Amino acid sequence: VVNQNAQALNTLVKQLSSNFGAISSVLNDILSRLDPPEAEVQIDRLITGR
């Protein structure tokens, strides 16, 4: 039970580094590199994946 809880938590933490079809996993890079009125199409997919 301890091991399965720990590995589930570790998988949940490590899932934050995925791309989910966006340009990058880093939120700051997406919001800085791209123009603000067109970055929503990149933010939304990452939000849905998380």
Partner: protein
């Protein structure tokens, strides 16, 4: 190539299926293997009329 960027959902799915499939043998063992020796009925059938 497009699937490998989504993370490790499929690893979790395979782990769940393996955990489901492995417990059927445990259920069968804990239900039917309660005996320690293979007892054999005697060739005679004098059970008092039963």
């Amino acid at each position: 190539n497009l699937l490998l960027q989504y993370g490790s959902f499929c690893t979790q799915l395979n782990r769940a299926l393996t955990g489901i499939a492995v417990e059927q043998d445990k259920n069968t063992q804990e239900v039917f293997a309660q005996v320690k020796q293979i007892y054999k009925t005697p060739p005679i059938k004098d059970f008092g009329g039963f």
